[PDB]
Amino acid sequence: RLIYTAGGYFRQSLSYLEAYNPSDGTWLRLADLQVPRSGLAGCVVGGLLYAVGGRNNSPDGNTDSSALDCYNPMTNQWSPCAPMSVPRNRIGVGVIDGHIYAVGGSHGCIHHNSVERYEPERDEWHLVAPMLTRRIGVGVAVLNRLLYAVGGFDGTNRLNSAECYYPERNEWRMITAMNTIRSGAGVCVLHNCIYAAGGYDGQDQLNSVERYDVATATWTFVAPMKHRRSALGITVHQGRIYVLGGYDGHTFLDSVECYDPDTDTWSEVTRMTSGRSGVGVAVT
């Protein structure tokens, strides 16, 4: 299983698809995206990688993306899928029962609270219940078959608030807010807990990482990342969190740090082939 990273931004939105293998520490250069994009999210359903939303920030202009594109690792080929109801830049994404949930993001000045679900078997999007809070740069995590939306930006303020979606009931509920305000953090699930890593608090890029425990309903801090970052990629591979690139306030990072929950330590495991922010990431 590899860590796939799609798109991102350095001077302009990028078309890269690359895969890191933690076994031998090597990088694979795979087929480019058909359209360049940053602020996208990545996910896996049935062994196929999906690139969702984002925006093509190029020299000619800015085009927000409603596009869903599917990459098959066996064929090294990208294929277009049905587009979302609206463009979603700085989107959040999660998977439940092989269905892709597109959460939040922006289209111009519009900051979405709306959410929609994709069915791969039918190639159809449908709108579900909208979030209680409008969120761009939102972190998404699936835990106990519930879709969590964590942090982000509502149009006016950056958020420490988080909320939880109930697919069977089709409704959202606000949960315990985070210790820190985090827009553009990395949010993932490891060992029955939601991790929120880095992001931007309104003033500074964060290196701090905090962990939601469901039973206690409390966010507690864990060991911080060596390098502060926002608009970072995030994923989990064999019981370790990987964070990929991002923006530190001054430069674009190629750094990849890995978190070991047993030792509560971060270490830099590799570098991306080039520094970038706003990548989509997934594992398969």
Per-residue tokens: 280:
């989509």
Please say whether the beta carbons of 268 and 6 come within 8 A. Answer: no
The two tokens of residue 152 are 């982000």
Resolution value (Å, 1 decimal): 2.0
Dist CA 244 CA 185 (whole Å): 11
For residues 67 and 85, the answer to whether their CB atoms sit within 8 Å is no
Rounded to whole angstroms, the Cα distance separating 190 from 242 reads 11
CA distance 115 to 104: 6
Method used experimentally: X-ray
User: In this structure, what DSSP letter does residue 178 have?
Assistant: P
| Cα 177 from Cα 194, distance rounded (Å) | 12
Q: Please name the residue that has the structure tokens 């109801």.
A: 85
Collapsing DSSP to helix, strand or coil, 217 comes out as: coil
- Which residues contact residue 62 at a Cβ distance below 8 angstroms, ignoring those fewer than 6 apart? 55, 56
Q: How many residues are there in the chain?
A: 284
**Alpha-carbon span 16 to 29, nearest angstrom:** 8
* Mode of pairing for the β-strands spanning 139-143 and 55-57: unpaired
